[PDB]
Coordinates of C-alpha atoms and ligand atoms in Angstrom, one line a residue:
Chain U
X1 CA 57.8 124.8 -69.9
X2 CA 60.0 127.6 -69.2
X3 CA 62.7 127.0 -71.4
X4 CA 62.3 125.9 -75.1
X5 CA 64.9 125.8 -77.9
X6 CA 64.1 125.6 -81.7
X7 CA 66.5 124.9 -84.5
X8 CA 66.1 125.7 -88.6
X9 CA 68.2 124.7 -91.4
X10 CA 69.0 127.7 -93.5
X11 CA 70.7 125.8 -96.2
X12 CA 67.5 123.3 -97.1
X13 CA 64.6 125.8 -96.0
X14 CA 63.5 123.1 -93.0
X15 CA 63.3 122.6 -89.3
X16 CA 66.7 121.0 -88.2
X17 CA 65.8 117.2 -87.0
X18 CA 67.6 115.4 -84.2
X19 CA 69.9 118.0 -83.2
X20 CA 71.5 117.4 -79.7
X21 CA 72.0 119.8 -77.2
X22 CA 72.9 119.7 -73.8
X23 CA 72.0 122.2 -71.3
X24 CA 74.4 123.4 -68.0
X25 CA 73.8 125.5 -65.2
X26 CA 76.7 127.6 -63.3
X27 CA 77.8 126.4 -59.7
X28 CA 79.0 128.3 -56.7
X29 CA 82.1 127.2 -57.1
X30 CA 82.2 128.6 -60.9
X31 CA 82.1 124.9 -63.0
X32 CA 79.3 124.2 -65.3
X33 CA 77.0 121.4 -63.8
X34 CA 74.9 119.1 -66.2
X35 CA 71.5 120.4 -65.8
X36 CA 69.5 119.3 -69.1
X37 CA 69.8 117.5 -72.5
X38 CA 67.6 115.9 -75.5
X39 CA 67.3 116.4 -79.7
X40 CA 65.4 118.4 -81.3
X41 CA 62.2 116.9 -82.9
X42 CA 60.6 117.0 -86.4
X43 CA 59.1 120.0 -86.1
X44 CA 63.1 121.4 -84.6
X45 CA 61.7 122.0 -81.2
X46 CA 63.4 120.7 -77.8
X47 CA 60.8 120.7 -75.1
X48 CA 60.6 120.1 -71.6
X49 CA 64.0 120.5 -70.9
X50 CA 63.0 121.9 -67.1
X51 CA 60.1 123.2 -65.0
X52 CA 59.4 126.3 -63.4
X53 CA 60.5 125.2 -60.1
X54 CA 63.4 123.7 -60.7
X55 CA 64.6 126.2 -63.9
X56 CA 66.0 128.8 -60.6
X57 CA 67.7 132.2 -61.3
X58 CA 71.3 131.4 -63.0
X59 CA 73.9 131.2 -65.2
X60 CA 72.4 128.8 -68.2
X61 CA 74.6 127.3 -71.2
X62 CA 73.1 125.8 -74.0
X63 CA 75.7 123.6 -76.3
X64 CA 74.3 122.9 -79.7
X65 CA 76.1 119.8 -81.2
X66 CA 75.3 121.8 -84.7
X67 CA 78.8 119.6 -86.5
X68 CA 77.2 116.6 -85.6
X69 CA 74.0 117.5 -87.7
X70 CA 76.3 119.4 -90.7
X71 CA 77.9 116.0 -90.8
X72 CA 75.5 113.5 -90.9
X73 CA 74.2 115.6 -94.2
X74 CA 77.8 115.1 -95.7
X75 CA 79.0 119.1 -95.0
X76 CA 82.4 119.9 -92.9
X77 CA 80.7 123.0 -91.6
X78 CA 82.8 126.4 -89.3
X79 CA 81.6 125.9 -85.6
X80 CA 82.2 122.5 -83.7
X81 CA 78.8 123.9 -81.9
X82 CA 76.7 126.8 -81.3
X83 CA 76.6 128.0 -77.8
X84 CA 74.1 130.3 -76.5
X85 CA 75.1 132.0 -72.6
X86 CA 72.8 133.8 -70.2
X87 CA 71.2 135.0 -66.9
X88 CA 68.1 133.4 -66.8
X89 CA 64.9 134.6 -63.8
X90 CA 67.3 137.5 -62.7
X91 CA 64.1 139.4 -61.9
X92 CA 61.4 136.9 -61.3
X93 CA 60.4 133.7 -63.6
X94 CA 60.4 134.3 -67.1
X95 CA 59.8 131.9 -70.1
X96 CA 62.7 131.5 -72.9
X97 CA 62.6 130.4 -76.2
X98 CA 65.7 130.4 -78.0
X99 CA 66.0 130.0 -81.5
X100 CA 68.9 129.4 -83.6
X101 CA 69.5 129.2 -87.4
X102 CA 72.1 126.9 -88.9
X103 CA 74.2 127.4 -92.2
X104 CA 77.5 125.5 -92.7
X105 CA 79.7 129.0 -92.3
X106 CA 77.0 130.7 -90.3
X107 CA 74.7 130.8 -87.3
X108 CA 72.6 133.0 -85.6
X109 CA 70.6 132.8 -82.2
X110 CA 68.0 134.7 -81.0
X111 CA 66.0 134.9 -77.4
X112 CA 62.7 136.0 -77.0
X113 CA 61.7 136.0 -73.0
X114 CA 58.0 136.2 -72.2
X115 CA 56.8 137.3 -68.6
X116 CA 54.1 134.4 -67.7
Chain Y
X1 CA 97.5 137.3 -89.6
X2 CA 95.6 134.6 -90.2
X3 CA 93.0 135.6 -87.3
X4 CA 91.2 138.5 -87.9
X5 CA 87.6 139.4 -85.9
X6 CA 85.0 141.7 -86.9
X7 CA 82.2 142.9 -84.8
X8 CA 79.3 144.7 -86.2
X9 CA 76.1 146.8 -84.3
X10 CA 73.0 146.0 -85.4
X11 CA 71.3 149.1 -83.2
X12 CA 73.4 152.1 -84.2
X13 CA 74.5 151.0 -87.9
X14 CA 78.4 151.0 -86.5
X15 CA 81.4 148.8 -85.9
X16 CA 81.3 147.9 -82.4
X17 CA 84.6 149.7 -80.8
X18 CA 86.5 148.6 -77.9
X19 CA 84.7 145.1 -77.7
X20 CA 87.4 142.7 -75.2
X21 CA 87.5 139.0 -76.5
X22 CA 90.2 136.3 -75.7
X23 CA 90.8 133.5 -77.4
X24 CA 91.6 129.7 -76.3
X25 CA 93.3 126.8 -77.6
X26 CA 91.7 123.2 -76.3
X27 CA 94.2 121.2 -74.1
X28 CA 95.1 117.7 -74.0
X29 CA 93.2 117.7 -70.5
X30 CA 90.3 119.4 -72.3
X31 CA 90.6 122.6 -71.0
X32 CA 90.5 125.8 -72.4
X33 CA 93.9 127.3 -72.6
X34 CA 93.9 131.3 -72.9
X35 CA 96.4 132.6 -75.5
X36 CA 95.7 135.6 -77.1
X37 CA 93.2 138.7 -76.3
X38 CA 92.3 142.3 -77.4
X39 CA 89.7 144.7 -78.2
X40 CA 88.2 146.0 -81.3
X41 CA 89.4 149.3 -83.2
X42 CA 87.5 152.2 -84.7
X43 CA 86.6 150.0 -87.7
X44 CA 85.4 147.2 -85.2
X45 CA 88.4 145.3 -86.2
X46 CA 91.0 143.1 -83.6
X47 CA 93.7 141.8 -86.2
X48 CA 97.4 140.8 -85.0
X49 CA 95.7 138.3 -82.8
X50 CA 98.1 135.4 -83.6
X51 CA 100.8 134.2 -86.2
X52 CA 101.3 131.6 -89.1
X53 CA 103.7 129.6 -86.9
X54 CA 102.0 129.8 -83.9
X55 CA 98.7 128.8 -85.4
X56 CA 98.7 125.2 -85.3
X57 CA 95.8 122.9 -86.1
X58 CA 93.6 122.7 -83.1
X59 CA 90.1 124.1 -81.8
X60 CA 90.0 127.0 -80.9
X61 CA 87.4 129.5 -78.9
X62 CA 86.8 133.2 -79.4
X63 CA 85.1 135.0 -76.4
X64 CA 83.3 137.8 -77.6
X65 CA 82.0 139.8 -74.2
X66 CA 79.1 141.3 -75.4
X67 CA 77.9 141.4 -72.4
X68 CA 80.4 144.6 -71.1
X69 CA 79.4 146.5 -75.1
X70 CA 75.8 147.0 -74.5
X71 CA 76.2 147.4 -70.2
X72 CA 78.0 150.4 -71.7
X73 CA 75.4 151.7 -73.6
X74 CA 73.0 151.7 -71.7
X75 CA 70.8 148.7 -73.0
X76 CA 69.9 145.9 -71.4
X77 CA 71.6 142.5 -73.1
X78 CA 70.2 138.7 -73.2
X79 CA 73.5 137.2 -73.7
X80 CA 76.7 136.7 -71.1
X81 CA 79.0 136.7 -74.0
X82 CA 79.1 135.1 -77.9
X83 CA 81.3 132.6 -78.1
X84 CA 83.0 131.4 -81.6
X85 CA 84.5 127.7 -81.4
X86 CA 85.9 126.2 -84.6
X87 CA 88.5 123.8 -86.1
X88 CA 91.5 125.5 -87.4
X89 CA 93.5 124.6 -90.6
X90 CA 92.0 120.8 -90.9
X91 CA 93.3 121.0 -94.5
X92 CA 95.8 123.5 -94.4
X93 CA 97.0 126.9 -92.9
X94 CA 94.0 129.4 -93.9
X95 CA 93.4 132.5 -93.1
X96 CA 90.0 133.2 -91.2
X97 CA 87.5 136.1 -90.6
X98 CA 85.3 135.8 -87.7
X99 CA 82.5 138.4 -88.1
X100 CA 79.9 139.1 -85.7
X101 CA 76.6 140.9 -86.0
X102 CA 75.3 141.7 -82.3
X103 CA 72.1 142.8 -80.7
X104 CA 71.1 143.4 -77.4
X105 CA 68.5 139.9 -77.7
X106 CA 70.3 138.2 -80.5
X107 CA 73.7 137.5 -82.5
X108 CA 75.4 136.3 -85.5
X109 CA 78.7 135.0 -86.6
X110 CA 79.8 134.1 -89.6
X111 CA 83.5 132.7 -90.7
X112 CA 85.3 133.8 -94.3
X113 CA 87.8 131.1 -94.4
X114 CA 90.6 132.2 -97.7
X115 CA 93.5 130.2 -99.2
Chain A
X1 CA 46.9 127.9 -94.3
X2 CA 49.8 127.6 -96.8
X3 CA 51.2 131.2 -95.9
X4 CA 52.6 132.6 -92.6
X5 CA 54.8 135.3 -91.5
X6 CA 56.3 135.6 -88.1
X7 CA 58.2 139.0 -86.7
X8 CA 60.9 138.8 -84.0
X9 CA 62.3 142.1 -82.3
X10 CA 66.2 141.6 -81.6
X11 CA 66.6 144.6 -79.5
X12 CA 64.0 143.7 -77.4
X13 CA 63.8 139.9 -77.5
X14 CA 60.1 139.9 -77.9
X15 CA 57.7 139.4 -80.7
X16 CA 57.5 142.3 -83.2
X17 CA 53.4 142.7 -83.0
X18 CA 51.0 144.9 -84.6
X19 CA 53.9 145.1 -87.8
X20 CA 51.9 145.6 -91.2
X21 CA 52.6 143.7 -94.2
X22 CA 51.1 143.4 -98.0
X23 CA 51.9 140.7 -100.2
X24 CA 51.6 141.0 -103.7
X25 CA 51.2 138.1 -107.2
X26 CA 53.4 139.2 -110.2
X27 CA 50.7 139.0 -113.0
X28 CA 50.7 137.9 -116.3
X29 CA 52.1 141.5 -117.5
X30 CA 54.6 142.0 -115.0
X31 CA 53.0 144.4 -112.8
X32 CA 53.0 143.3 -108.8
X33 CA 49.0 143.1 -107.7
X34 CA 47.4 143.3 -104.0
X35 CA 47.2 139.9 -103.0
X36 CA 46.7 140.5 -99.7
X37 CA 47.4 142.1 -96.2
X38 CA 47.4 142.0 -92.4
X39 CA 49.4 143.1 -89.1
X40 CA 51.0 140.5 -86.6
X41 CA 49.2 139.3 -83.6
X42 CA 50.8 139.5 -79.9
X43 CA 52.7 136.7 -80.9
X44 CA 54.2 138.3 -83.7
X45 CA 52.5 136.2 -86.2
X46 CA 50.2 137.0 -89.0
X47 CA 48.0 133.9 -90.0
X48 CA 45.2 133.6 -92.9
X49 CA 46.6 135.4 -95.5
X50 CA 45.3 133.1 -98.5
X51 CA 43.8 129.3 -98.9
X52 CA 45.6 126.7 -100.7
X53 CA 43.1 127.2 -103.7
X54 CA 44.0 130.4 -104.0
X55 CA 47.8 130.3 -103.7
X56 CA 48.9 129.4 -107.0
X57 CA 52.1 128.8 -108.5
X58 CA 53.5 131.8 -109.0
X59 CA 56.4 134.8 -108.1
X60 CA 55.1 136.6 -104.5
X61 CA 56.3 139.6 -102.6
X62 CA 55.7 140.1 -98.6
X63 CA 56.6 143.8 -97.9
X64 CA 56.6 144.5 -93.7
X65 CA 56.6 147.7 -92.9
X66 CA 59.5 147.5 -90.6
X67 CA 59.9 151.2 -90.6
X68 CA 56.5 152.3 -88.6
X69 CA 57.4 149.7 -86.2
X70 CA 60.6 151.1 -85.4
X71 CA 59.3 154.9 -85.4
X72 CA 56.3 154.1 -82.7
X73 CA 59.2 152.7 -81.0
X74 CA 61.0 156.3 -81.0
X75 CA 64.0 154.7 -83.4
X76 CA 64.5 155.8 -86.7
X77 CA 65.7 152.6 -88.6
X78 CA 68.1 152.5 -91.6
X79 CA 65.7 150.3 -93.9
X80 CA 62.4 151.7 -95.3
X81 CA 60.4 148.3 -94.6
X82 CA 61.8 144.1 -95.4
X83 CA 61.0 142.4 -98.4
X84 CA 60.6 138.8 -99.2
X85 CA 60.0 137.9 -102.8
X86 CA 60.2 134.5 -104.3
X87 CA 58.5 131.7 -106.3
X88 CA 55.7 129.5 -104.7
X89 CA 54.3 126.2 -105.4
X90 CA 56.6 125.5 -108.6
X91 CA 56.8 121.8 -107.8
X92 CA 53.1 121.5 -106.1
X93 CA 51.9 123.2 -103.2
X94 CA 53.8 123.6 -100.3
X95 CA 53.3 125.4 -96.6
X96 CA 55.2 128.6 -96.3
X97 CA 56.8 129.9 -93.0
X98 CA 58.4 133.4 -93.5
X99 CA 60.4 134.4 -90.0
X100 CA 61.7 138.3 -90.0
X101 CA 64.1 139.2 -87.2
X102 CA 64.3 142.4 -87.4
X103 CA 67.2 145.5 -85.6
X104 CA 67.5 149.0 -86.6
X105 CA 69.8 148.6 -88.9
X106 CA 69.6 144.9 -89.7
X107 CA 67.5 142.2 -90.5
X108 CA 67.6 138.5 -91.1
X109 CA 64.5 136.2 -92.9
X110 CA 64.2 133.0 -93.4
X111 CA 62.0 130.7 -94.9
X112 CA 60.6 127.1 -94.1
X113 CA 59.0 125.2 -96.6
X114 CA 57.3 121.9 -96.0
X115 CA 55.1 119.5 -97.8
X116 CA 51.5 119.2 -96.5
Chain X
X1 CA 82.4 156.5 -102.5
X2 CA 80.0 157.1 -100.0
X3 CA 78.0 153.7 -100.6
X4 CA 79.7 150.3 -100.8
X5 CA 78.0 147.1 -100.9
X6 CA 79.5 143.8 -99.7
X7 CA 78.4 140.4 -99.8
X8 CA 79.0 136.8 -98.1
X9 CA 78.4 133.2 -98.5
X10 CA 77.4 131.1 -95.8
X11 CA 77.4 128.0 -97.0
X12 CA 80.9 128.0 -98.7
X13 CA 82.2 130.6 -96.2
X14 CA 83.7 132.4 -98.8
X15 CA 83.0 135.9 -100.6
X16 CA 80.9 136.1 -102.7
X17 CA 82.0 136.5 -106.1
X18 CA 80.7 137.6 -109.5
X19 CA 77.5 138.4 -107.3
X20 CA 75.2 141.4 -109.9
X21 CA 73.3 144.1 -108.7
X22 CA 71.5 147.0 -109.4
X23 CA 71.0 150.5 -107.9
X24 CA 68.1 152.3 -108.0
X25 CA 66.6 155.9 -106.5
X26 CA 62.8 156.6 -105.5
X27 CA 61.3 158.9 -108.8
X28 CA 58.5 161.8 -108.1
X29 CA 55.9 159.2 -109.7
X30 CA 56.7 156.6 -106.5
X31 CA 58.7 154.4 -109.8
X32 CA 62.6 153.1 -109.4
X33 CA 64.8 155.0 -111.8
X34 CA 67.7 153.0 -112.0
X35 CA 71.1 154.9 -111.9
X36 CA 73.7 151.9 -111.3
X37 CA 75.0 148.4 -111.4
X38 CA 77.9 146.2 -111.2
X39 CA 78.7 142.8 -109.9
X40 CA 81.3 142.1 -106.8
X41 CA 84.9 141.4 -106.9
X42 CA 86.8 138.2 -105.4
X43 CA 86.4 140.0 -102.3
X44 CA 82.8 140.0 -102.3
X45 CA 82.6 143.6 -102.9
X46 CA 81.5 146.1 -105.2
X47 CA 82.8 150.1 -104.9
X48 CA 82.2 152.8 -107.2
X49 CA 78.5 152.6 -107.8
X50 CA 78.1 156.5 -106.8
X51 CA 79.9 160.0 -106.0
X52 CA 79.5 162.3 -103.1
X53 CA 77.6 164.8 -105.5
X54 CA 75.4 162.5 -107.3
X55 CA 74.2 160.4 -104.1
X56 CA 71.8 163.1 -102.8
X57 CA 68.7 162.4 -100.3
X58 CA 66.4 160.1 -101.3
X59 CA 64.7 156.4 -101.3
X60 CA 67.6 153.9 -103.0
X61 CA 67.1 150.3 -103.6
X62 CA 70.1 147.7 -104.2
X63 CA 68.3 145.4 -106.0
X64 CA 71.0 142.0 -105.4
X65 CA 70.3 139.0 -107.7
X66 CA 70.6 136.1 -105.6
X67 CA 69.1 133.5 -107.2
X68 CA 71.8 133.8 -109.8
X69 CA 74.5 133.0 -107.6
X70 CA 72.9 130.2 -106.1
X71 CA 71.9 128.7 -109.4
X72 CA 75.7 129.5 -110.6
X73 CA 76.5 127.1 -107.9
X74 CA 74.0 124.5 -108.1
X75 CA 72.0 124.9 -105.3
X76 CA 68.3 125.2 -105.1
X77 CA 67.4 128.8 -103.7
X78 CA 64.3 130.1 -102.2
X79 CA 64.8 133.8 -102.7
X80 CA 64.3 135.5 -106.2
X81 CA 66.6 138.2 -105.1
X82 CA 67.7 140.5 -101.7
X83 CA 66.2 143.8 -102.0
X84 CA 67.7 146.6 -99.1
X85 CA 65.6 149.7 -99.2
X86 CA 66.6 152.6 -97.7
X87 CA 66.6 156.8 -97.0
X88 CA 69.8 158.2 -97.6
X89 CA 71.8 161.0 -95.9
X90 CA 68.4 162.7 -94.4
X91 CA 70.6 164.3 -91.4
X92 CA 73.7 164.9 -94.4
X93 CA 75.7 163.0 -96.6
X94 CA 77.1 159.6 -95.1
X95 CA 79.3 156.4 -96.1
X96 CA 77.1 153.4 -96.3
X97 CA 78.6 149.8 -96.3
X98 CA 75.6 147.4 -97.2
X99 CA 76.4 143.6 -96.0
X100 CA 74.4 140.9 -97.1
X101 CA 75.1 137.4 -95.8
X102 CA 73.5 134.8 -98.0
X103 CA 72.1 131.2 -97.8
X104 CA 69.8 129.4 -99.9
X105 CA 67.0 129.6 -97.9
X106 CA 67.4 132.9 -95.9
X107 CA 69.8 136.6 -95.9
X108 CA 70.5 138.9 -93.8
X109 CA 71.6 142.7 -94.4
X110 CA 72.7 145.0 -92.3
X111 CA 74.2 148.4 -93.3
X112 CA 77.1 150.5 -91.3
X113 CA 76.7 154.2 -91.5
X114 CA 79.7 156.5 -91.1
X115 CA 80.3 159.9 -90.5
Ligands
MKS201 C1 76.7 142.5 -90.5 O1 76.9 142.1 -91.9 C2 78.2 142.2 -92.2 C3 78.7 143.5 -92.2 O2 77.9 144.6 -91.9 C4 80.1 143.7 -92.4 C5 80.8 142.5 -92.7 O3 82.2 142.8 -92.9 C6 83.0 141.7 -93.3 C7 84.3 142.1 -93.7 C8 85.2 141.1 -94.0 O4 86.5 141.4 -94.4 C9 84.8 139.7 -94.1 C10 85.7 138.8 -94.5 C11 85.7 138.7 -96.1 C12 87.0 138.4 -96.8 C13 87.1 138.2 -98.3 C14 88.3 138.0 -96.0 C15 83.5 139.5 -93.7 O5 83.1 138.1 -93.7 C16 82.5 140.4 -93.3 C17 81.2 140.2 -92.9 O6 80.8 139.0 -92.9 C18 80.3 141.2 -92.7 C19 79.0 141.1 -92.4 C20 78.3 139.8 -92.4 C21 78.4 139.1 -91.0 C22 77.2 138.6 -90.3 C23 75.8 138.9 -90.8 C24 77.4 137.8 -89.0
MKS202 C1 65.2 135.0 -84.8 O1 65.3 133.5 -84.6 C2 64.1 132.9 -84.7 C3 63.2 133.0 -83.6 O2 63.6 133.7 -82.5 C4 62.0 132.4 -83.7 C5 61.7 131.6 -84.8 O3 60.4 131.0 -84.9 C6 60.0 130.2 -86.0 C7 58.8 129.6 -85.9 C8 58.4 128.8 -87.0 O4 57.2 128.1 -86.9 C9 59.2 128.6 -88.1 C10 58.8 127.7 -89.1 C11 59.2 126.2 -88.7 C12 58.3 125.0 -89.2 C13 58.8 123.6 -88.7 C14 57.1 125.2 -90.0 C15 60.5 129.3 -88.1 O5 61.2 129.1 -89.2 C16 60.9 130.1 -87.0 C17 62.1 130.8 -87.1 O6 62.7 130.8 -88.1 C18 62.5 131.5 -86.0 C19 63.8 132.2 -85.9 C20 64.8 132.2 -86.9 C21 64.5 133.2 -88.0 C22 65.6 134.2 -88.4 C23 67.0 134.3 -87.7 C24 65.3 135.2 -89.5
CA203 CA1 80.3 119.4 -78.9
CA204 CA1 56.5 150.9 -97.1
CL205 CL1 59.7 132.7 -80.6
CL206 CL1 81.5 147.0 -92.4

């Protein structure tokens, strides 16, 4: 799959389980269209959110729902999500995994594109 | 000021100068209303951004464009922008520090929240 | 194996590859012994460093040599290489996942720890 | 002072406070001679660890005892300490603010260099 998002817990030293995230492409007309969405598993990965066909050149948003997973552990973290924003394919099909780690005041998120 | 954004260069060991960002206030309707903008210092700094009256409780959004920083250096960026969406003042008026730490393929933001 | 270390390049949203690394054992008289070393692979990974038999409890150091990395790039980086040092194993063995991002003039590690 | 060091918290999103370190400079036998030390203020920094005159090129360590602040707070941390190693003012003296942002299982540092 072209697209691939991983998520680690920087507070307990762990993948970060059953995170949800939801995945939106940019229209013509400028609004963000649902394009994909699932949880992250136990190893933190979210997989086969697209294919190669159908992941075209774009405007891609991921929304993390990283409050939800602060929550459920009992923490009132910062960010009511993390958000990652980007051109994807601009000059031919590329493969993305993006990678973000989680702390209750703090994240980072990282891309590293591959050309297949 | 209790709104104050930082933003950092992890490539040339600098603040990041004359970085535009707006911020928004969520709507009833859901929708991000614009309120305040500017762009960082010398020191990488945007402070006077809002007031203690005028910041309420609400969510708010900070648009960092990131994007228009590294276009003008001459290096090629992953993101569009980094965006910063929080819940201000849940328990109380505080004063808040957004930093950011930006790369070209890669960001982080952190919040120092102070009573 | 019970010991990994993956590199990340945040300027160029790649694997870091062919980065060297030595990890040392703090002995008995405080001195920091070779334990062993490696480079990363093209997917920025270094595998097989030790075997769970050898891996004992004890304090470890993981010294990358983020500088030459930098340099063959044509940058001259602010840090002179990125060190991880901490204890292993103190409650039983455990699977160690060390993740380096590394910029010029930054870097960010992490460290997953599960149980086998 | 041409080398300040400043540190965060990432889980409390706070300063952080009371946080030790040590200095150290590269000998001619490849050992660390340390030189300084102190421990940050409630504003997560720490300032007059060197002078202009005395901070000369070199190799310097900050040597930044994390596992005592997280144990200080309870938390279980994976890191014996943060180590930042780095050559100092090899095109001329500079002004070095170290930041470390800290969680229990992972830091970051990143250092702004001034002229
Ligand atoms: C990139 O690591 C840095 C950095 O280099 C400089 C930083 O500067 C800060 C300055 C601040 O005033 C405050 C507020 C502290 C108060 C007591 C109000 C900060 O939080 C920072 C920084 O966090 C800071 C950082 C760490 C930020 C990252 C790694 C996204
Ligand atoms: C820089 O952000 C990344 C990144 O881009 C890729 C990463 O890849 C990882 C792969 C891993 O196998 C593991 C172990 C997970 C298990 C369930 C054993 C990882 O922790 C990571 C990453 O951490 C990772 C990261 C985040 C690392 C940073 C920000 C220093
Ligand atoms: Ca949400
Ligand atoms: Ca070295
Ligand atoms: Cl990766
Ligand atoms: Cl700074």
């Amino acid at each position: 799959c072209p697209l691939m998002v991983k998520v680690l817990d920087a507070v307990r030293g762990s993948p970060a389980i059953n995170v949800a995230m939801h995945v939106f492409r940019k229209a013509a007309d400028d609004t963000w269209e649902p394009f994909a969405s699932g949880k992250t598993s136990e190893s933190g990965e979210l997989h086969g959110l697209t294919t190669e066909e159908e992941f075209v050149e774009g405007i891609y948003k991921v929304e993390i729902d990283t409050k939800s997973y602060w929550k459920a552990l009992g923490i009132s973290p910062f960010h009511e999500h993390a958000e990652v924003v980007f051109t994807a394919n601009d000059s031919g099909p590329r493969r993305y995994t993006i990678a973000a780690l989680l702390s209750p005041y703090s994240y980072s998120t990282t891309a590293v594109v591959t050309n297949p």
